[PDB]
Amino acid sequence: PGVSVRDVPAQDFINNYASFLQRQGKLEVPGYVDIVKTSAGNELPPQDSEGWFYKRAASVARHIYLRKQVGVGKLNKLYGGAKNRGVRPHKHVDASGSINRKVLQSLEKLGVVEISPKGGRRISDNGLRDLDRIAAATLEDEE
Amino acid sequence: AIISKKRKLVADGVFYAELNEFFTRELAEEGYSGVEVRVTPTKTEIIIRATKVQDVVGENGRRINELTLLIEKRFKYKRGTIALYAERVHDRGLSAVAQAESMKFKLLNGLAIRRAAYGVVRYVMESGAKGCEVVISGKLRAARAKSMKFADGFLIHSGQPVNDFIET
């Protein structure tokens, strides 16, 4: 046999990663938690509020696993969306700049993210271990 | 220069289209038709088709050497890289613009407008056209405007066989 990351669906993975981060509690805090919009178009901050950021960095981690060299802006642009701009139509604008940077900076210290050449960030050795274990753990919950 | 490929080729087309309209206005007396601008390395062959070729040349480098320097001062070039050659037209009747400037002159000079058209049509049929037309408009006598139409043979208006065949 052979265990892998993808066999676990992304919804259940990020939840299992979030719970994994809550068990440690050493992912770190940015300093703007629940005094923050998250997306520059978004009338209400995160509803889960407390926690939340652990689901966020898990999401950035699995995106950086899947892709070659993802930076800040590409995350912003990915995680952005539709402004309820008014009686005018919608537009796309990239999500909050700093928060995603604080997600990345925190993931660098833990050892999930590694700095890549050319432009952006890639994955560490010890980051890949936790990804695979969390994948193995969620597969056991399904069985 | 260097500019982008897509901006150079549009600036070349403009440059040509400027030159084209200059030589329409400047070489009216000479009976000019069209330019064929070739752009090789170092030299660029700006060929100019016209009826009265001896008038375009002048007296062995005179009018062409005025115009070469004019093209250089418009578009920043140096002497040597631009070279003018005034050639004859292979059958003048087939080219529409040549006939246009002849009809232009015949009206300007003083001639019967109807017969001016009929004479130029007969010339075009003699040269070797499957068909032809002349529309002349405005006020050919009287105050109120008219069009007047003088033609011969098969005239295709529609389809692509138009850009290929009919010189307008």
Binding site: - | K5, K6, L9, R38, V39, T40
Partner: protein
């Protein structure tokens, strides 16, 4: 004595296709006579230039439009060949209209 291969790329960009394709055929046929290692006539995507414009001057009557566009045919013929053989293939194989051009620097 030299045999110093600089790796030269040839640029062929133009509007007309039947000239361009004939020009591109002429260079590879010269490469076959001079017998060089070369990548074939590579064909890059055609940048179509779309000037949208209302047909009218006055902006009155019905609202009609003309997409006045320009075809462009960007091609490449990469040579693994010396400087002197490139100087030959620049001198010959020159047609009107098509923009022959050399990069020369790998």
């Amino acid at each position: 004595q030299e045999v110093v291969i600089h790796k030269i790329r040839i640029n062929l960009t133009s509007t007309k296709v039947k000239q361009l394709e004939n020009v591109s055929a002429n260079i590879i046929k010269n490469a076959e006579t001079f017998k060089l290692v070369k990548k074939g006539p590579v064909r890059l995507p055609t940048k179509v230039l779309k000037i949208s414009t209302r047909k009218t001057p006055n902006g009155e009557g019905s609202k009609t439009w003309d997409t006045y566009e320009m075809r462009i045919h960007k091609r490449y013929i990469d040579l693994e060949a010396p400087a002197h053989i490139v100087k030959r293939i620049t001198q010959i194989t020159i047609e009107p209209g098509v923009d022959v051009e050399v990069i020369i620097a790998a």
